[PDB]
């Protein structure tokens, strides 16, 4: 096999991680500038992104350390709901930081152990940088709005974000029980502009059964159901169907009709005003449902079927293990409505008011699918910002706080740790550099200013990267939810060390 030992593998641990840093840091922040995505399998085909996650794929990653961070990115991207491009260069900075120092002969043992509590040293400061915002609801409104445009900013929606910055928080504003991805119903449908993106307050079926079933039913008793009206699922009534003869087609047709008529009548025994079937509904039953004055929605969307059941407070048929036993949803209105260009069956009066159906209106799907995707990312933060309504001063400000904290802790701890911890505290101060370098402004100025600012202990004043000056962190919007940083501050302050442990690297390829 091929063993990459420490130094070489460490330089190899560097090659990807450091160079992967180059782009994701270049894209770091809104004034973070894009990297061309060259598709080497598909033509040369060019793509332009402010996001590193998309970069991690198009040109694949050989470097294991960088290959590791692709997890960390996605991990942080998916879990934190943000910090995609951030946590990555964060591992690039310290490895870069550790380069000369492990090239200074300093053990990663020395290094890792140093950055270990250094990582924790930022925490208490971070835990101190925790700024409760959203504690009040008017806070929570602006608190959500604080981080509403924050996540979508580096998730590469620069246009309709504002329109969603207003939308996404509203759905999250009502929750207040917990940040909810289920009660909140996510719909994105073509028609209208992307600033025409809509919020249905209630459940929504983007399904439309049309007038084939009753379109308008008020105070509608819902049957949330998996119950097959053609396929005819279990608790089956009959003999196992068989064909023994040429003309046998008749009886199987007649045998299923009863089996269909049973679940019709059985679900007609719910008295439900609207039948919602996660499976389809055949001609014989649907003409029975339609003659029963019941709206029968066929093959309704699976999570929505539960979301319907949830938000309308009803129960799902449980695969017709409950013939009558499934509880019934009741919403004051079932109305097929045209929002944008398309008719969707809108359920308002659903039992959950915190529940909101955001109906995203595509001008095209290619932005619309990217819309909700990046839009769903703030929700993670927002949902966890519902749970922890808290903030941390962004723009590298909490950095400079945690910098001094560990920068003094370097001089407070000192030793083989402060060997590493200073290198650590530099990557703390390296974050304010990138966004300012992305913004093309003097970092050593804006850093050592913000240093002097946090040397005066001003974390309410920070690098404000819109204009890219040093300025207030008042929660101008430049402030971040406490969730993100503690999350983003973590995995790279881990993985970089974790990468420092692997030294002998045996590559059997």
């Amino acid at each position: 096999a091929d063993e990459e030992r420490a130094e070489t593998a460490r330089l190899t641990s560097f090659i990807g991680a450091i160079a992967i840093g180059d782009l994701v840091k270049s894209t770091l922040g809104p004034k973070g500038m894009d990297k061309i995505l060259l598709s080497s399998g598909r033509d040369a085909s060019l793509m332009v992104t402010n996001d590193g996650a998309t970069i991690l794929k198009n040109i694949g990653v050989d470097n294991p350390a960088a290959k590791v961070l692709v997890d960390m990115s996605r991990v942080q991207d998916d879990e934190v709901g943000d910090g995609t491009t951030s946590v990555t260069v964060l591992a690039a900075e310290l490895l870069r930081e550790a380069e000369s120092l492990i090239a200074k002969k300093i053990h990663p043992q020395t290094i890792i152990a140093g950055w270990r509590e250094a990582t924790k040293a930022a925490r208490e400061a971070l835990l101190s940088s925790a700024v409760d915002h959203g504690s009040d609801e008017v806070k929570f409104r602006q608190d959500l709005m604080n981080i509403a445009g924050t996540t979508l900013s580096s998730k590469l929606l620069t246009h309709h974000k504002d329109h969603f910055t207003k939308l996404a928080v509203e759905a999250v504003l009502r929750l207040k029980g917990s940040g909810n991805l289920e009660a909140i119903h996510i719909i994105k449908k073509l028609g209208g502009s992307l600033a025409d993106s809509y919020l249905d307050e209630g459940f929504l079926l983007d399904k439309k059964i049309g007038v084939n079933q009753p379109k308008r039913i008020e105070n509608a008793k819902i049957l949330i159901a998996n119950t097959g009206m053609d396929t005819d699922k279990i608790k089956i009534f009959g003999s196992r169907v068989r064909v023994d003869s040429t003309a046998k087609v008749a009886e199987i047709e007649h045998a299923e009709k009863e089996k269909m008529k049973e679940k019709v009548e059985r679900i007609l025994k719910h008295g439900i005003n609207c039948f919602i079937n996660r499976q389809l509904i055949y001609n014989y039953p649907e003409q029975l449902f339609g003659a029963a004055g019941v709206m029968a929605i066929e093959h309704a969307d699976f999570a929505g079927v539960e979301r319907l059941a949830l938000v309308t407070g009803g129960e799902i048929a449980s695969t017709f293990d409950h013939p009558e036993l499934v509880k019934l949803g009741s919403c004051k209105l079932i109305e097929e409505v045209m929002i944008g260009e398309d008719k969707l069956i809108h359920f308002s009066g659903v039992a959950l008011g915190e529940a909101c159906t955001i109906v995203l209106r595509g001008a095209t799907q290619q932005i619309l699918d990217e819309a909700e995707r990046s839009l769903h990312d703030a929700l993670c933060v927002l949902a966890q910002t519902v749970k922890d309504s808290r903030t941390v001063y962004g723009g590298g400000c909490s950095e400079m706080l945690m910098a001094h904290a560990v920068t003094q802790l370097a001089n407070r701890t000192p030793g083989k740790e402060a060997v590493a911890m200073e290198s650590y505290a530099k990557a703390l101060r390296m974050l304010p550099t990138i966004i300012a370098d992305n913004a093309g402004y003097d970092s050593a100025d804006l850093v050592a200013q913000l240093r002097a600012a946090h040397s005066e202990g001003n974390t309410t004043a920070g690098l404000d990267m819109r204009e890219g000056t040093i300025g207030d962190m008042a929660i101008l919007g430049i402030t971040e939810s406490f969730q993100v940083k503690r999350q983003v501050l973590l995995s790279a302050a881990e993985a970089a060390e974790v990468i420092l442990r692997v030294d002998n690297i045996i590559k059997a390829a």
Partner: protein, 517 residues
């Protein structure tokens, strides 16, 4: 045809044990920087006990080719110090060549190394104590079962995992009259739980087989009734069905199912338990009709799986539907359906108190690699207690036993003299390597660290103290509670000079032009 002579060979010989043992020297102790393995397909994984990474390494060299074999029995009986011997077997050679660099026979010093082992052995035999006992040994094992799982998978391990690890051993370790071997104890990995969560089982635990939950999902008794044959009409794990010619034959068809169940049940009922392990699978339909009948079966059981529950219970598998006895069924002090985690179906928990030929500790896990990393860690420590429970012998060292035996064996070479005066000196120099060369990987200085426990040998010998392999503030083997089985280090003494002699054995290097495969 080529022949690479002597030093040429020796040069070739040394080209591995320098670096490939340094792979261990870089990995010595937890503070030893751990070994990533990227596969033939490019699959990255972190490794230690580098016989792992050496098997994961693909051998281009006979020493590399050999070392995996030399490393095996160490990782077999002891389970730990796999990093030590490879270093130590890789080290002394470096001293040994230096003596042929001095112009000394490999012949002579190896001999003087062979008994240098012996004189270190007795010297090693002094260290710690050669007896630990059930209440005593556990906590130092619970320390080891920790510090193995606390170094190598979790940081604190878990007093779940530590104790449950020693108890898995201690279970059969007591069964084997103060011995054990592994097969008697088997860690069963399944993820979706937590690393923390380890179900210590005296026998098989596998997922049960039901169809409808409305029909009973139940274990019967604590006893299992093991069947190769049907408890439910046997389907040779391939396509088999039921069919009817009429609506009435459909009615005739299902009572067949229920009566065959009853037929099978009534047999398997009266002969003990009711509870089936049935190799073959059955239709998911009449499976609930068997539940509806009563007393569930287990269908689609692995061919060997029925045998695993067979003999470990002390019984067998029922080979034929007509051939039936509790012996051909299972013997279990516990059989019960138990949900594995909250994430999936009930594992049927067979805890076999009527016999255990394998006491199988189940382990849950958060991730495969880390539940592996646990299982990785475990079998390492499983074998050290296995050394202990067999003959309870421990040694304070890795910061001590070397510099301990490094002291006297080199001291012995003073009273040795001639060909063995360099041997037992340079022998113990390889001992000088590891605890030093551990501190190498550490941020502490190995040369510096050596000098201390060196000065300690002037102070104190075979000490309960030593270097800190845990990279602590205290440098001990006791406040460290670091140790091995006095077996292990002695067992580790065996291997190093064993390859040293081994590269000597014949005079024949002559190759087709191929000395490597």
């Amino acid at each position: 045809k080529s022949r690479l002579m002597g030093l040429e060979a020796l040069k070739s010989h040394i080209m591995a044990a320098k670096a490939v043992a340094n792979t261990m020297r870089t990995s010595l102790g937890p503070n030893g920087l751990d070994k990533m393995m990227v596969d033939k397909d490019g699959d990255v994984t972190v490794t230690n006990d580098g016989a792992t990474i050496l098997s994961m390494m693909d051998v281009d060299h006979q020493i590399a080719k050999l070392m995996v074999e030399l490393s095996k029995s160490q990782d077999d009986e002891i389970g730990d110090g796999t990093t030590g011997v490879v270093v130590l077997a890789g080290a002394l050679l470096e001293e040994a060549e230096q003596l042929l660099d001095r112009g000394i026979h490999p012949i002579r010093i190896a001999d003087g190394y062979e008994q240098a082992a012996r004189v270190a052995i007795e010297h090693l035999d002094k260290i710690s104590d050669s007896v630990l006992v059930d209440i005593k040994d556990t906590e130092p094992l619970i320390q080891t079962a920790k510090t193995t799982l606390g170094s190598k998978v979790v940081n604190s391990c878990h007093r779940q995992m530590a104790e449950i690890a020693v108890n898995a051993v201690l279970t059969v370790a007591d069964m084997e009259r103060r011995d054990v071997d592994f097969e008697l104890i088997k860690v069963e990995g399944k993820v979706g739980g937590r690393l923390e969560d380890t179900k210590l089982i005296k026998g098989v635990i596998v997922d049960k087989d039901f169809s409808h939950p409305q029909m009973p999902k139940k274990v019967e008794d604590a006893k299992i009734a093991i069947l190769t044959c049907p408890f439910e009409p046997p389907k040779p794990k391939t396509k088999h069905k039921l069919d009817v010619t009429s609506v009435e034959d459909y009615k005739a068809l299902q009572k067949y199912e229920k009566e065959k169940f009853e037929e099978m049940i009534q047999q398997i009922k009266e002969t003990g338990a009711n509870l089936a392990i049935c190799q073959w699978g059955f239709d998911d339909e009449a499976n609930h009709l068997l539940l509806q009948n009563n007393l569930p079966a287990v269908r689609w059981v692995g061919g060997p799986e029925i045998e695993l529950i067979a003999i470990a219970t002390g019984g067998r598998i029922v080979p034929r539907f007509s051939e039936l006895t509790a012996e051909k069924l299972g013997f279990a002090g516990l059989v019960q359906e138990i949900s594995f985690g909250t994430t999936k179906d009930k594992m049927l928990v067979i805890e076999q108190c009527k016999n255990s030929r394998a006491v199988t500790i189940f382990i849950r896990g958060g991730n495969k690699m880390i539940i592996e990393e646990a299982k990785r860690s475990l079998h390492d420590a499983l074998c050290v207690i296995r050394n202990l429970i067999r003959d309870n012998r421990v040694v304070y060292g890795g910061g001590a036993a070397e510099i301990s035996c490094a002291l006297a064996v080199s001291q012995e070479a003073d009273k040795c003299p001639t060909l063995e005066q360099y041997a037992m000196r340079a022998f113990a120099d390889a001992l000088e390597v590891i605890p030093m060369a551990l501190s190498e990987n550490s941020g502490m200085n190995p040369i510096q660290t050596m000098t201390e426990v060196r000065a300690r040998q002037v102070k104190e010998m075979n000490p309960a103290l030593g270097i800190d392999c845990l990279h602590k503030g205290t440098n001990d083997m006791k406040q460290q509670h670091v140790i091995e089985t006095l077996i292990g280090k002695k067992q580790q003494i065996s291997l190093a000079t064993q390859m040293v002699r081994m590269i000597l054995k014949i005079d024949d290097i002559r190759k087709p032009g191929e000395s490597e495969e």
